[PDB]
Amino acid sequence: RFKKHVVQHEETMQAIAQRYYGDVSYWIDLVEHNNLKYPYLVETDEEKMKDPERLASTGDTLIIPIESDLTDVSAKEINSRDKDVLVELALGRDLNITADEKYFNEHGTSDNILAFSTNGNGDLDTVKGIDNMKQQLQARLLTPRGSLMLHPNYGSDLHNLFGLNIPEQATLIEMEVLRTLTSDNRVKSANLIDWKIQGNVYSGQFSVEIKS
Amino acid sequence: RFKKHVVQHEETMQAIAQRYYGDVSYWIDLVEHNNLKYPYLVETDEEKMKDPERLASTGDTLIIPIESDLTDVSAKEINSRDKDVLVELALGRDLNITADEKYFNEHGTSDNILAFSTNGNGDLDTVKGIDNMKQQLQARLLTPRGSLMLHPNYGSDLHNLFGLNIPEQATLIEMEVLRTLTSDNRVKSANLIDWKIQGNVYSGQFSVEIKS
Amino acid sequence: MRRIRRPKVRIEIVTYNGDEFGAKLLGFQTKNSMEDDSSVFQINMAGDTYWDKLVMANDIIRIFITPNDDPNDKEGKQERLIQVGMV
Amino acid sequence: PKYDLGKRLFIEDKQRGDTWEFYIESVEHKFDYKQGYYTTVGVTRGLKDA
Amino acid sequence: PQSDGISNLHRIALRFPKEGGGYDMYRFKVNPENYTIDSPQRTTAIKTKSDIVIEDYGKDIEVINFTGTTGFRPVREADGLKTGKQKMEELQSRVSEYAMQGGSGNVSGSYLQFFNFTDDSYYKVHLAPQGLKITRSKDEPLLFRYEITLVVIGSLTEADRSAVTTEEFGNVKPNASQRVDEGIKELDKNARKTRDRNNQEISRRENTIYNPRQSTNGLKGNIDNMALIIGYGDGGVS
Amino acid sequence: PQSDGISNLHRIALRFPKEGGGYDMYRFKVNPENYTIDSPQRTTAIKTKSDIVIEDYGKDIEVINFTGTTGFRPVREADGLKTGKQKMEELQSRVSEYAMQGGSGNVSGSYLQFFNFTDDSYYKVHLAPQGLKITRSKDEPLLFRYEITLVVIGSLTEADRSAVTTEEFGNVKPNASQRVDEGIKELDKNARKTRDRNNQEISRRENTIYNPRQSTNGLKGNIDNMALIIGYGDGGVS
């Protein structure tokens, strides 16, 4: 996996490699990972006009490998394709089934909710990257734990939790949400920011550390 | 051994095996136990009317082995055809000697109290299943600890526990009854739910957990 | 000043994933000696999983030991292999 | 004292419902009032699913 | 029972085993000064590099320990008028009868029933390794204090291990095998030798709750009898 | 929250696995008198002849221990009117049931789930080897006391380690291996013998997560699948 960087004023190419790897000498590998010509960085943006794809300038974005994938030619090849789209390799692409967030949010835990839909024309709607991650948390959490017809212990116990509105029960809802969300490797961790018990409405908001 | 179950509205045969045994993969061997033709579970009873014995429909019972007996071919063959005769075979059949139910409850801890009877026509009466257990428990409880001609240390000291009705005697009687009942390995536990006194009369009741 | 050390052992196996095998590490020994005509090593594993049914004989296990802290940029950050052999 | 040399040993594992079979080749007894009373059972040529 | 809302609590009682059949009991006139129950667990926790491993192996011995004294006043008894001193002497003699001839000779009872009417709890107990401990002190010239530790064999409601009955459906003795042994007793030396040879011959070329209803466990047992009486070879096979 | 003049006190509750699946959710009616939490470290110190060496291996298993007394006066319950003695007995019976059922190494279900309703913190915990020690001395005759010690497995916010759903992109269960194995099973013994010969010949001539896209690990599976649809020698290779 990788890190983003933003090129700064008169930024020395070797300073990038030092700043993230301690030794200077890995800049040969970094520029091969980013498919740069010899002018690795340039002050003037008009010079980029000549060879835009093979020439970077101030404020442009570069891809920094982690140390282990530094000398892997295959990673160099793939990292030469997915330039500023590399996120898509970790989070993935999947089919869209959230046809209207105005619909299922008002019906909640039930059968017969979500459905495939079509964006544009002819091509079936494929939802990707961060927008795949939105769906793959949302569609997971709405499913009850026992539900799915292979690999059980999917879903969540959330539908059980509509007990008495008293504080302990609210923390129990926090716990099942936390438990459900940290269950997928694409998220590092989760924690609660705030919660609000109305007379019969639970409201609470949670952070999640998506990777990259 | 086995667990009982019933067919629910539009439940698929895959769903049952997955919920009880974990892996969906096991449904294939599980249909042979319930001797089912291809339409293994079908919603409609007028469709069960096609060939009633070889199908299950909504509201019908099902048999669910323990996982060790799931792979046994003999368990498959027996569960295929016996169906409801399972419970009776699994908890036993023997002669009925509770001929005078009103009477043996007037002279317990005295001998000569039980006797063969006749049900049906021209054949000694027999008891089965739960009533097999009601018979043996009632007799065993009303038998003194060393009075069967073989395998002694069978029975109770209930004939010995008559005393001043102070509570220690009542706890002693409770413990003897519980020991009595828990002797048969087929019963899981017993526990008292009430003990009650009426001068020179004891009264109380016990709940016993019989295996499924 | 006194040195600080944060060991971090890795294990890789080739015929169950190796990273899950390394997680249940508890301790090991590696007797290597030119005096005798045989080099032998031992590994202690936790009882969390039934290893008897998993680890078939004659498999190859690789062990990697992290000497000191990564970000400090010490010379010990080399992930030097310590021993490799056949169970 | 039931265990003796040359006798076939059957073990049933309650940990995970497994079954084991063994062949006894050695037994070493140990009796002492200071700490209980133990009996070693050496086995060889063992196999599962008995 | 306690003293609260309900009628007067019942003291703690001990039941010992009578040599001559039946049972004898001992109730404390004065409830114990201290009453401790230890219920540990046999489980060990050992952390690996980046995970925690927890393993358990059941419930541990539930150790019961309590300390009490005996009153100086006399009190009515079931037979006679026994003061605190006599009560404690009888307790000592009972413990010594249960302990001294436990490892030597023989004791009828296998265990002791410990009744906690005040706590509404019952257990089957055996003398601990610490054992009984009696002591009398300066600031108690007339009294006698006792300290006893116990180990719980198990719940009193459950039945004894040796007094348990299994399912035992169908015949428990496979009569064919048991009478094949009997028919074999009569056989001549040559018949037995030929039996052994036939058994070897079958053996070296192999790879290439008795109830006949709803079971196939007793299959070969009935064949042996039939092969013995009818005669497959001079002795038989299997 | 604690009693701070802004919110009323709230008291501890413990979630247990229900034996039919789901849970029981017990709660205390008087909070603990002593509360202690330990956080041991696995750091070790060794003294070399010329320097000290400090080495650490990370966080060690935490210990939670607290002690308290169940209230005396009757107090209404969310489904009854239960007294302190009934509450203590319920606790002892939950604990006994949880300890006894763990006789298969470790429960496949839940550890105990702990909510600190007093200071905001949540843990997953297991019975320590001290266990549930219950005592009632002469002082405070009508008040029970309980001592509980636990070990922390991890924060309740984090799901189980092994249960985490990995990325699993591409295909973890490739069909190439399966149909190769089926082919080789279907081959004749002479066919496999010749395949072994060809493999040995190739080995002599050596010298002197899976994805069909953007991955090379599955290269052999596509090649191993060939040499059977095409007769590359009387049997496949590798």
CSV table of N, CA and C in Angstrom, one decimal, chain A residues 1-7 16 20-21 29-36 60-66 70 75 78-80 82-87:
chain,number,residue,atom,x,y,z
A,1,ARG,N,0.9,-1.2,0.0
A,1,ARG,CA,0.0,0.0,0.0
A,1,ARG,C,0.9,1.3,0.0
A,2,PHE,N,0.3,2.5,0.0
A,2,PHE,CA,0.9,3.7,-0.4
A,2,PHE,C,0.5,4.9,0.4
A,3,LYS,N,1.2,6.0,0.2
A,3,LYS,CA,0.8,7.3,0.7
A,3,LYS,C,0.8,8.4,-0.4
A,4,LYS,N,-0.1,9.4,-0.2
A,4,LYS,CA,-0.1,10.5,-1.1
A,4,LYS,C,1.0,11.5,-0.7
A,5,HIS,N,1.4,12.4,-1.6
A,5,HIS,CA,2.2,13.6,-1.3
A,5,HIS,C,1.8,14.7,-2.3
A,6,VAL,N,2.0,15.9,-1.8
A,6,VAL,CA,1.7,17.1,-2.7
A,6,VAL,C,3.0,17.9,-2.8
A,7,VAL,N,3.4,18.1,-4.1
A,7,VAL,CA,4.7,18.8,-4.4
A,7,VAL,C,4.6,20.2,-3.9
A,16,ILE,N,12.0,14.4,-0.8
A,16,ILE,CA,10.8,13.6,-0.7
A,16,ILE,C,11.3,12.2,-0.1
A,20,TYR,N,10.6,10.7,3.8
A,20,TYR,CA,9.7,9.5,4.1
A,20,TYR,C,10.5,8.2,4.3
A,21,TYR,N,11.8,8.1,3.9
A,21,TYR,CA,12.5,6.9,4.1
A,21,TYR,C,13.9,7.0,4.8
A,29,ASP,N,14.1,4.7,-7.1
A,29,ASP,CA,13.0,3.8,-7.2
A,29,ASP,C,11.7,4.5,-7.2
A,30,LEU,N,11.6,5.6,-6.4
A,30,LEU,CA,10.4,6.4,-6.3
A,30,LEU,C,10.0,7.0,-7.7
A,31,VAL,N,11.0,7.5,-8.4
A,31,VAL,CA,10.6,8.2,-9.7
A,31,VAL,C,10.3,7.1,-10.7
A,32,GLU,N,10.8,5.9,-10.6
A,32,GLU,CA,10.3,4.8,-11.4
A,32,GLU,C,8.9,4.4,-11.1
A,33,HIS,N,8.5,4.5,-9.8
A,33,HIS,CA,7.2,4.1,-9.4
A,33,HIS,C,6.2,5.1,-10.0
A,34,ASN,N,6.6,6.3,-10.2
A,34,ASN,CA,5.7,7.4,-10.7
A,34,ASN,C,5.9,7.7,-12.2
A,35,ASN,N,6.7,6.9,-12.9
A,35,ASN,CA,6.8,7.1,-14.4
A,35,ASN,C,7.2,8.5,-14.8
A,36,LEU,N,8.2,9.1,-14.1
A,36,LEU,CA,8.7,10.4,-14.4
A,36,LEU,C,9.9,10.3,-15.4
A,60,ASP,N,1.3,19.3,-7.9
A,60,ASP,CA,0.9,18.0,-8.4
A,60,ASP,C,1.1,17.0,-7.2
A,61,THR,N,0.4,15.8,-7.5
A,61,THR,CA,0.4,14.7,-6.5
A,61,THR,C,1.3,13.6,-6.9
A,62,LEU,N,2.1,13.1,-6.0
A,62,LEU,CA,2.9,11.9,-6.2
A,62,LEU,C,2.5,10.7,-5.3
A,63,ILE,N,2.9,9.5,-5.7
A,63,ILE,CA,2.5,8.3,-5.0
A,63,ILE,C,3.8,7.8,-4.3
A,64,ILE,N,3.7,7.6,-3.0
A,64,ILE,CA,4.8,7.1,-2.2
A,64,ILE,C,4.5,5.6,-1.8
A,65,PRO,N,5.3,4.6,-2.2
A,65,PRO,CA,5.1,3.3,-1.7
A,65,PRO,C,5.4,3.2,-0.3
A,66,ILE,N,5.0,2.0,0.4
A,66,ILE,CA,5.6,1.7,1.6
A,66,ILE,C,6.9,0.9,1.3
A,70,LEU,N,9.0,-1.4,-2.4
A,70,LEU,CA,9.8,-0.4,-3.1
A,70,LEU,C,10.5,-1.0,-4.3
A,75,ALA,N,4.8,-4.2,-8.5
A,75,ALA,CA,4.2,-3.0,-7.9
A,75,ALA,C,4.6,-1.8,-8.7
A,78,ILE,N,2.1,-1.8,-11.7
A,78,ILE,CA,0.8,-1.5,-11.3
A,78,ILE,C,0.7,0.0,-10.8
A,79,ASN,N,1.7,0.4,-10.0
A,79,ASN,CA,1.7,1.8,-9.5
A,79,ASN,C,1.9,2.8,-10.7
A,80,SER,N,2.4,2.3,-11.8
A,80,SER,CA,2.5,3.2,-13.0
A,80,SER,C,1.1,3.3,-13.8
A,82,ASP,N,-2.3,2.8,-12.0
A,82,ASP,CA,-3.3,3.4,-11.1
A,82,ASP,C,-2.8,4.8,-10.5
A,83,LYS,N,-2.3,5.7,-11.3
A,83,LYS,CA,-1.8,7.0,-10.8
A,83,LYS,C,-3.0,7.9,-10.4
A,84,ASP,N,-2.9,8.3,-9.1
A,84,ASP,CA,-4.0,9.0,-8.4
A,84,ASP,C,-5.4,8.3,-8.6
A,85,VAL,N,-5.4,6.9,-8.7
A,85,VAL,CA,-6.6,6.1,-8.6
A,85,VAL,C,-6.4,4.9,-7.8
A,86,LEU,N,-5.1,4.7,-7.3
A,86,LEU,CA,-4.7,3.5,-6.6
A,86,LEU,C,-5.6,3.1,-5.4
A,87,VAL,N,-6.3,4.1,-4.8
A,87,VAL,CA,-7.3,3.8,-3.8
A,87,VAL,C,-8.3,2.7,-4.2
